[PDB]
Write a protein that binds this ligand. Structure first.
Ligand SMILES: O=C(O)CCC(=O)C(=O)O
Ligand SMILES: [Fe+3]
Lengths: 429, 18
């Protein structure tokens, strides 16, 4: 290679290299003052300003400091405002700026930087793809889709754009349309296409259309390190946790929680029925495109380990009971929620996002016939007043073909083998 | 959008820095 030095910077190359050596050697403190001296002496030098930014970037890593990183993000931008900045250096500095903005969660700011990069380099296809990721990270699938359509209209064989276009189409329930994009994009082997998310959704799209080749892709994703197994396809995993589709209460160790749910099941049921009868708007239709057909709604009391205060006004006794069990109320990778499913409902085979939780189902109103849940190769039924426990990171599937409603209570717990340290530190899901 | 029962979002965690 990259050309980083403009005309003036070539004349001070010895000073610039000496400062950069201190950074590469890890003498970060001395390197900062070395580049500060160069910025003071040569205030228009783009290489000196980039050195200052990289030193701040390294210092933020060393200190684990968000504030120091914000300084680096400003300096990376300063580089771009300087006169006569070489194209290679301008791209490097703004790319790192956007990457570090994304790291801090400044998704809107990152998007602005990505847009500047595309405007500055209109022929760099990779920068457009990065802009599409920015939109995907902020939840703007409409603009993300437009970006990848723009990429594919110029470079139709770009595998990165293909998998991300296919991902968007699958997210929009354009299942049949998404399959060739996900498949050809993965087959391209282009950088960024070897990703568990695309194996996940290609196999699931195929499953939904009855393409029996789905599990060939699950096997390849497993062989390439993306899935713990062809059955357990969660993507946010702590490696090594005991992997089992169905669990007994005793195997989980949460026997006190299970006893409470089963001893007190009727008060949980009764508050659920009261909400169905008097506040049924608190039940929200399932919104992750997991239904083939039918009606499925959930009334959530806890999510990401946070109590929903208004929701608990609707089931105050149940919330009081559950407050005694931090293994579920503090499970920041699970929920506590009522789940109602009506006849004519089929939930597609799917997997949850993480292997870090186990899922308890407490039966509340279970019709005598018509309702069942498969996890992996084993199908079971609910019973009123009784807890079932399964690892929903394994593929599971639900049918409701009864003649009245089926109400259950879902209680997620931390996987029992996670230490207290892991339970405090894992990002919420 | 959050990944509750499924894995339908591009990312399921929020970026909060260090
Ligand atoms: O049967 C239900 O209410 C939900 C089934 C399901 O996918 C789950 O609980 O993970
Ligand atoms: Fe599920």
């Amino acid at each position: 290679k990259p050309k980083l030095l403009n005309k003036f910077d070539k004349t001070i190359k010895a000073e610039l290299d000496a400062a950069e050596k201190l950074r590469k050697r890890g003498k970060i403190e001395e390197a900062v003052n070395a580049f500060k001296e160069l910025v003071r002496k040569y205030p228009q030098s783009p290489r000196a300003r980039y050195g200052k930014a990289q030193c701040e970037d390294d210092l933020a890593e060393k200190r684990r400091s968000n504030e120091v990183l914000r300084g680096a993000i400003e300096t990376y931008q300063e580089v771009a405002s300087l006169p006569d900045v070489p194209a290679d250096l301008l791209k490097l500095s703004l790319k790192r700026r956007s990457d570090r903005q994304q790291f801090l969660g400044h998704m809107r700011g990152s998007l602005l930087t990505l847009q500047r990069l595309v405007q500055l380099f209109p022929n760099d296809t990779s920068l457009k793809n990065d802009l599409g990721v920015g939109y995907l990270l902020i939840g703007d699938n409409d603009n993300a889709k437009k970006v990848y359509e723009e990429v594919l209209s110029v470079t139709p064989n770009d595998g990165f754009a293909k998998v991300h276009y296919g991902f968007i189409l699958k997210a929009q329930n354009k299942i049949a349309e998404s399959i060739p994009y996900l498949k050809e994009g993965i087959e391209s082997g282009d950088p960024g296409t070897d990703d568990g998310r695309f194996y996940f959704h290609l196999g699931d799209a195929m499953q939904r259309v009855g393409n029996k080749e789905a599990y060939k892709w699950y096997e390849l994703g497993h062989k390439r390190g993306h899935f713990a197994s062809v059955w357990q396809r969660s993507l946010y995993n702590v490696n090594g946790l005991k992997a089992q589709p169905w669990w007994t209460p005793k195997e989980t160790g949460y026997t006190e929680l299970v006893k409470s749910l089963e001893r007190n099941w009727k008060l949980i049921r009764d508050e659920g029925l009261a909400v169905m009868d008097k506040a049924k708007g608190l039940f929200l239709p399932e919104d992750e495109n997991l239904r083939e057909k039918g009606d499925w709604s959930q009334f959530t009391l806890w999510q990401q380990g946070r109590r929903n205060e208004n929701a608990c006004k609707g089931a105050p006794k149940t919330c009081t009971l559950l407050e005694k069990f931090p293994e579920t109320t503090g499970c920041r990778r699970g929920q506590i929620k009522y789940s109602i499913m009506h006849p004519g409902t089929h939930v597609w085979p799917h997997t949850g996002p993480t292997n870090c939780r186990l899922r308890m189902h407490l039966g509340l109103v279970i019709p005598k016939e018509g309702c069942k849940i498969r996890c992996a190769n084993e199908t079971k039924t609910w019973e009123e007043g009784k807890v079932l426990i399964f690892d929903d990171s394994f593929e599971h599937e639900v049918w409701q073909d009864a003649s009245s409603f089926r109400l259950i209570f879902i209680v997620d717990v931390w996987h029992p083998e996670l230490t207290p340290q892991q339970r405090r530190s894992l990002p919420a899901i | 959008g959050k990944c509750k029962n499924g894995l339908g979002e591009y990312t399921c965690t929020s970026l909060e820095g260090f």
